[PDB]
From Swiss-Prot, chain F:
Protein name, as recorded: Uncharacterized protein CTHT_0071780
Alphabetized UniProt keyword annotations: Nucleus
Cellular compartments per GO CC: nucleus
Source organism of the structure: Chaetomium thermophilum (strain DSM 1495 / CBS 144.50 / IMI 039719) (Thermochaetoides thermophila)
Protein location: Nucleus
UniProt key word Nucleus: yes
Top-level taxon: Eukaryota
RNA sequence: GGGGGGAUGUCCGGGUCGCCCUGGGCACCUCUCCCGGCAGCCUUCGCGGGCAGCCGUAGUCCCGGUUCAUACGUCGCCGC
């Protein structure tokens, strides 16, 4: 039973009383930003997509 | 800065909160802050103090004046003592390590004293 | 560094250095004593560096700044640790009055 | 009212764990015990318990009889020698002393 | 200094012999031909071939079969193979423990190893996997043959000693299994001046085989066992380990401090090296979920369970027999009740990848304990058999006191003082009475507020006073203590006392030829299970 | 052996109904092991047994059941009572075990008995030497200690036996945890009695010398902080608190100054000790590196003598050869040194004189 | 080049099979050259390396006698002095270095050394 | 002030050392002090600090600057090393309650700022 | 480290004044026993015990100023 060579495990350090949650990273993962301006700087009324 | 701080702590902003935290003004701000957002301010100050250790002086000043101004305002709350509990936890971690750090401070103060003595000799020579 | 404290070899890891790498480990120790999540390991590394390399501090001026700049941040971390035990008394006063 | 069971288990002594003939059983000699395991399934096939009783007398040596297999020679620190046979237990209750001061080793 | 030797015959006559002497300094000296050198007053110059790889003493050397290879094994947990036709060397490096004995099969195929952690593995050659594995109880043993690297006066000379009792629980939901704390090997456990037992094993009682093994504290089997100076490393010892009411949780405490030789540069004023090592302690409190296949999984780890200006020692933990709750008593004074909640930050729960939610343990209750300082305090706790009351002995010298605390509310139901002569060793709670031992042993009923039986135990050394301990049965109301008969050494005797709850006469008085290191209670039935130094296990039962 | 104690208790019951206190007191003297002379040590008392202790408290003290009772002196003039005080058997667990019958319905029993008992000892003796002995002898909870401090401040706030116990109870109430001290102090104290106590603690702080300078602690800060949190805003809500925090800031600056001077002075003392050792050996002639001038060197490092032992592989210890010792000494010389050989060396008696270049 | 010297003798039995009897690090740098001699009652092997110290090993009594490190400094002293002028003097590759000492030793019985 | 400190310590005077104690010139004073005479200055500063707890705003600069320029002469005097190693033992004993006394400073910085708060509110109402 | 002595070098009252001594300060060599370690040889199964012990310091003919380290099974890319 030769034990398999394991590397050094990184330390699970404790987290403060407001960690970045799974859903906060999930909504931060909407990464790539493209800002398309409207014609003549018109305010955008409504966006929509079909079901 | 009271209404701005009220807005930031009531809608969970970051830009308004940081631009009002980076700045008398602090005393007027916490005195014109709403009573119900004091625990929200305590938690949002404990979070920044944990996440960044270099901002401890101003954040302890803010927490100090908040606990001065709205003391019984947190007692009339009392099912929300867990924000004070997380605050106690953060300050206990900040005050961890003090005896060994004092020993190391003395061990370095000896070197600084000798270096300043040799500079005081080298300026007169 | 925790593995090098657990395996008894932190003195062996620090004892063979030269001037620039002592300055590098001092710079890491100064930069990262601030986090209390590894204040213990970082202070232990600074203990061993003071015990090992405090003899050439007049020999090289740039290390003499890096020993003075690490006292400069250790001096600001008792004031942070005293203000957090000042403020920890006020939180302790409020939880007594809730009762 | 209360009764105490006979001791089982044991610590494996530093005497060499001897292979059987045709390599199918392994004879491991503990303190106060000698037991034969099978090499294939790693389940024990016999446990020959050995009465040790004189504070520290220990099993000094153990070897297969080189004249005939499926025998042993087990010897203590004081003068005692057993000629048991694994796959059975004939020889535990009949030791033979040797009139020593203290028996340091034996080899067959 | 000769540790071992293997002779091979060069042959139906006997032409020569080849001797391989494994010495205590680490080398293996191969004397190639002896009968043709000493057959011929005058002899020619004989000069052994030196093969030096082991740092410590080489425990076993054997020639292999045809005679091409020289297989060997020492403290460094590595089976080494000297190629001996070339100059090369190939090794099976990371076993569990020290290679204490090797043999070669009658054919050339199999090797058989006696590993120092009470084990034997028949390996096959160049598959190099154990085709037969047999494990024992692996507890601390007072060895008969002392040690093979205690011959040459090392930095820490290995001593046959037992400093503390074995940490073991019989597990409910499967009372044939026994969880107990072990190190890597026996010699690697006792080496370093402290017990370094960062592992547990599950050991079958009904058929005495070690079923499985797992790490609790941090261990590095794949790193070097010895420092560069020569001291063996110590690993965090699992001091207190006790098991939940359900059969589904397990809470352990493991402590580690750096060695005394290592500090040397943290001393500033009146600080000695013992004070610096005591300041730099690491006391983790880890909660394990036990699976169906005896596989432990972490759920939480608490780095500082009792904290003030520095970390505080944790003296005992106990499981509530009616709920999933662990009480831990510390050196700050307070008793903390830990309970499992689900992980849920803002209503959004966190679940495992298969779908079940993640449980996490946290401090449900804090109870500060009253102190009574007349002009180094240790603790002990136990629940009732019903729950709903936790008895907490708090332990400054001679003046010490038990506090009976409710569980539903944090208020103190009772306090009882003046019942301890020295420092408290342990305390258990049978059906109505507290059975507690200090220098005295007292059964003290709290439903009557009256001590029934009191004994002044015989004065002995501090090691034996540390190695006395008891255990209650909780099914048939009987308790059982264990005490060696009066520094500890090899030949000592111990005697255990079976008491009933009601009388003062001991119901069974049996002495044993070796000192018993642990007593435990089977949870399903009556009786006890005892584990000896010369590590054999035997069960005591009424009827 | 319960029946023997039961017969002895029935005989003492017969002595109680005879109302002959003297042979009862002599029987208690025989059990505890009239004249009634004392050994002069609070520690050196012989060990007695719990049932006789329980019977002693049951006969001495008394209870009034009207849904809440009152301990009273059935024997207010008794050597048995002063022995219970000096031997410290007057604990709440002891008196509850003595009175399991009448108190099993009573709630808040620890608070009632801890409030009532030191009052009873103080009304027994107006000189309260028995109260100070009880403070020094018995295991005391925070309610008993805050009532005892109330009693001593009632007495004050021939003339030192009270201030001794005033010093004792501060140490005990500093040993107690924060919760029981705060709740018992808030119960049993008035918010002006606390101001009296805070003036006593200021007398223990300023007169001790903390605010006082030099050219002209942990057990009192706990008491001050616990009293301040026990009053809180409901008691106060002047300049008294501003001068209060001024003197506490002054004492804090003193303690921080003591920290800095502690570190510096301890390091200089340890260097001076090891340098004294090395200079003694260099005067013997073992030729180590020592600093010459009277300022401190940069690295506070002294060269030790070479150990007689060597750590070989793998960890073993062997004797140092004098050859290797000479090699390390050849390393320990500098680049220039004057090594005067004397005629006494050439005769074979003395040693040389080495003066080496300061590195 | 691992400053290592290894000694091989033939394995007993089979012919033409050598094996390393023992190795030892005699030098402090690599062992660049060595040559043997065996005659007039003297079997040596002299190994010179990069630390300028020729090390003489006994060949036939190897493992039975200590070796010997010959001096790296030349046999001629290569140090000469004018004592009336107190000049010490030494020469190597093409330079002559002359030191003057300016004072006695009786004067110094450390900042002035 | 270099020559007033020399004469005040050789005669073990009580008054003349204090005349120089209350008054950078202080640093240039002790760099020219005789070193066996310099140990006489440390003997009385350790004598007053050991007998009673207190503070001194001027002596922190005084004691440290002499232990650097004239601490190497401490090897010559075996009496002063034992006096300094019992001095640094008792200065630990003041240092143990620094944590509990800092929490006392917190409550007084809390209550004094809250008593000033109601007094300002009576003039605000 | 102490308990103690023989002897080295020294100033302050000093002494007929010399050998030095008493009173104070002392640093060193040597002797003496207890302190911490190390080995041998008898006794006993061990535990322990007994006997004569060396080391706690300094530089060598040459020279231990050495000897000693933990495998294979398989690599790459991207995703959760």
């Amino acid at each position: 039973m030769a034990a398999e060579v394991v590397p050094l495990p990184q330390l699970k350090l404790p987290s403060g009383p407001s960690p970045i949650t799974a859903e906060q990273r999930y909504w931060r993962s909407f990464k790539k930003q493209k800002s398309h301006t409207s014609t003549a700087n018109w305010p955008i009324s409504h966006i929509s997509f079909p079901a | 800065l009271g209404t701005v701080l009220n807005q930031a702590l009531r809608t969970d902003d970051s830009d308004l909160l940081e631009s009002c935290l980076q700045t008398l003004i602090i005393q007027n701000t916490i005195n014109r802050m709403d009573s119900s957002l004091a625990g929200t301010l305590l938690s949002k100050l404990a979070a920044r103090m944990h996440r960044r250790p270099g901002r401890a002086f101003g954040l302890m000043r803010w927490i100090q004046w908040t606990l001065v101004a709205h003391g019984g305002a947190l007692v009339t709350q009392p099912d929300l003592i867990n924000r004070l509990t997380e605050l106690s936890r953060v300050l206990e971690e900040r005050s961890r390590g003090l005896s060994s750090l004092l020993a190391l401070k003395g061990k370095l103060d000896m070197l600084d004293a000798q270096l300043k003595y040799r500079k005081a000799l080298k300026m007169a020579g | 560094l925790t593995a090098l404290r657990h395996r008894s070899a932190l003195r062996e890891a620090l004892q063979g250095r030269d001037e620039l790498s002592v300055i590098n480990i001092l710079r890491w120790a100064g930069k990262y004593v601030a986090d209390p999540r590894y204040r213990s390991i970082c202070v232990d590394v600074a203990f061993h560096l003071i015990d090992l390399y405090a003899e050439h501090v007049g020999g090289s001026a740039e290390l003499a700044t890096q020993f003075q700049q690490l006292l400069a941040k250790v001096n600001r971390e008792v004031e942070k640790a005293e203000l957090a035990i000042v403020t920890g008394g006020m939180v302790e006063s409020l939880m007594m009055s809730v009762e | 009212s209360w009764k105490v069971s006979k001791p089982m288990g044991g610590r494996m002594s530093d005497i060499d764990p001897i292979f059987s003939q045709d390599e199918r059983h392994l004879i491991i000699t503990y303190n106060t015990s000698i037991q034969v395991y099978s090499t294939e399934d790693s389940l024990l096939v016999r446990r020959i318990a050995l009465p040790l009783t004189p504070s520290a007398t220990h099993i000094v040596s153990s070897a297969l009889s080189k004249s005939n297999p499926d025998y042993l020679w087990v010897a203590c620190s004081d003068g005692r020698i057993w000629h048991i046979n694994w796959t059975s237990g004939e020889g535990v209750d009949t030791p033979s002393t040797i009139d020593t001061k203290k028996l340091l080793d034996m080899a067959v | 200094i000769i540790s071992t030797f293997d002779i091979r015959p060069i042959i139906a006559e006997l032409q020569d012999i080849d001797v391989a002497v494994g010495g205590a300094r680490g080398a293996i000296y191969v004397y190639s031909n002896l009968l043709a050198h000493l057959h011929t007053l005058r002899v020619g110059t004989i000069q052994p071939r030196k093969y030096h790889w082991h740092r410590r003493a080489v425990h076993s050397v054997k020639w292999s079969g045809d005679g091409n290879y020289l297989i060997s094994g020492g403290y460094e947990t590595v089976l080494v193979l000297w190629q001996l036709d070339t100059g090369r060397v190939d090794f099976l490096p990371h076993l569990s423990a020290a290679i204490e004995n090797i043999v070669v099969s009658p054919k050339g195929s199999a090797y058989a190893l006696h590993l120092d952690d009470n084990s034997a593995m028949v390996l096959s050659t160049a598959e190099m996997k154990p085709s037969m594995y047999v494990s024992g109880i692996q507890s601390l043993v007072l060895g008969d043959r002392p040690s093979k690297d205690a011959l040459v006066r090392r930095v820490w000379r290995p001593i046959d000693e037992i400093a503390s009792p074995l940490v073991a629980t019989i597990s409910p939901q499967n009372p044939s299994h026994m969880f107990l704390c072990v190190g890597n090997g026996q010699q690697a456990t006792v080496g370093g001046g402290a017990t370094s037992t960062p592992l547990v094993q599950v050991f079958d009682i009904s058929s005495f085989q070690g079923v499985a093994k797992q790490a609790i504290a941090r261990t590095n089997p794949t790193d070097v066992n010895i420092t560069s100076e020569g001291v063996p490393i110590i690993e965090p010892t699992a001091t207190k380990l006790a098991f939940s009411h359900d059969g589904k949780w397990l809470a352990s405490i493991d402590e580690w401090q750096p060695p005394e030789r290592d500090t040397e540069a943290y001393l500033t004023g009146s600080k000695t090296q013992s004070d610096a090592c005591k300041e730099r302690r690491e006391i983790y409190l880890k909660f394990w979920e036990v699976g169906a296949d005896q596989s432990l999984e972490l759920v939480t780890r608490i780095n500082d369970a009792h904290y003030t200006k520095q970390t505080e020692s944790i003296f005992d933990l106990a499981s509530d027999p009616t709920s999933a709750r662990f009480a831990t008593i510390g050196n700050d004074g307070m008793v903390r009740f830990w309970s499992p909640k689900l992980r849920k930050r803002d209503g959004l729960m966190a679940t495992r990848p298969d779908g079940q939610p993640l449980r996490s343990w946290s401090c449900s209750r804090v109870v500060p304990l009253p102190v009574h300082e007349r002009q180094p305090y240790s603790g002990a706790i136990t629940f009732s058999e019903d729950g709903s009351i936790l008895f907490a002995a708090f332990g400054p010298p001679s003046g010490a006191l038990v506090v009976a605390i409710d569980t539903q509310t944090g208020t103190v139901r009772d306090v009882v003082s003046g019942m301890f002569k020295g420092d408290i060793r342990a305390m258990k709670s049978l059906s109505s009475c507290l059975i507690m031992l200090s220098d005295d042993l007292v059964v003290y009923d709290i439903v009557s507020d009256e001590m029934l039986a009191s004994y002044t135990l015989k004065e002995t050394s501090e090691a034996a006073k540390k190695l006395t301990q008891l255990a209650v049965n909780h099914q048939s109301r009987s308790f059982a203590l264990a005490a060696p008969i009066p520094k500890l050494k090899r030949g000592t005797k111990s005697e255990l006392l079976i008491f009933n709850i009601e009388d003062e006469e001991p119901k069974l008085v049996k002495t044993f030829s070796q000192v018993i290191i642990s007593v435990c209670a089977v949870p399903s039935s009556s009786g006890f299970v005892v584990v000896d130094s010369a590590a054999q296990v035997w069960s005591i039962t009424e009827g | 052996s319960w029946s023997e104690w039961q017969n002895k208790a029935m005989q003492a019951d017969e002595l109680l109904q005879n109302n002959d206190i003297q042979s009862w007191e002599e029987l208690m003297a025989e059990v505890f092991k009239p004249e009634w002379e004392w050994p002069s040590s609070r520690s050196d008392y012989a060990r007695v047994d719990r049932r006789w202790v329980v019977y002693a408290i049951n006969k001495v003290f008394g209870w009034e059941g009207q849904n809440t009772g009152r301990l009273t002196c059935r024997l207010p003039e008794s050597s048995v009572l002063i022995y219970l005080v000096d031997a410290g058997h007057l604990s709440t667990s002891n008196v509850k075990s003595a009175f399991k019958d009448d108190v099993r319905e009573v709630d808040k029993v620890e608070e009632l008995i801890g409030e009532q008992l030191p009052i009873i000892l103080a009304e027994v003796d107006p000189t309260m030497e028995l109260l100070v002995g009880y403070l020094s002898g018995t295991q005391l909870g925070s309610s008993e200690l805050v009532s005892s401090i109330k009693l001593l401040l009632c007495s004050l706030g021939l003339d030192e036996h009270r201030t001794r116990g005033l010093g004792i109870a501060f140490s005990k109430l500093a040993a107690c945890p924060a919760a029981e001290t705060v709740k018992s102090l808030r119960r049993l104290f008035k918010p002006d009695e606390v101001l009296v106590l805070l003036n006593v603690l200021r007398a223990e702080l300023i007169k001790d010398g903390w605010t006082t300078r030099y050219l002209d602690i942990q057990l009192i800060a706990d008491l001050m902080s616990r009293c301040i949190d026990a009053v809180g805003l409901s008691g106060w809500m002047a300049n008294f608190f501003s001068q209060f925090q001024a003197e506490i800031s002054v004492a804090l600056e003193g303690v921080m100054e003591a920290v800095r001077l502690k570190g510096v002075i301890a390091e200089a003392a340890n260097y001076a000790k090891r340098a004294r050792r090395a200079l003694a050996d260099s005067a013997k002639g073992k030729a180590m590196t020592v600093h010459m001038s009277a300022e401190l060197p940069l690295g506070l490092k002294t060269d030790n003598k070479i150990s007689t032992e060597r750590v070989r592989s793998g960890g073993e210890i062997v004797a140092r050869s004098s050859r290797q010792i000479g090699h390390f000494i050849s390393k320990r010389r500098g680049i220039y040194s004057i090594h005067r050989i004397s005629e006494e060396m050439l005769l074979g008696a003395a040693g040389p004189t080495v003066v080496q270049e300061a590195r | 080049m691992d400053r290592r010297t290894a000694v091989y003798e033939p394995m007993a039995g089979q012919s033409g099979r050598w094996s390393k009897v023992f190795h030892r690090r005699y030098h402090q740098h690599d062992v660049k050259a060595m040559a043997s001699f065996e005659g007039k009652g003297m079997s040596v092997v002299v190994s010179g390396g990069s630390d300028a110290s020729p090390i003489v090993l006994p060949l036939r009594a190897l493992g039975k006698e200590f070796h010997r490190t010959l001096p790296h400094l030349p046999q001629h002293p290569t140090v000469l002095s004018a004592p009336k002028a107190r000049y010490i003097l030494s020469w190597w590759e093409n330079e002559i270095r002359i030191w003057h000492l300016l004072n006695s030793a009786q004067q110094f019985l450390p900042l002035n050394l």
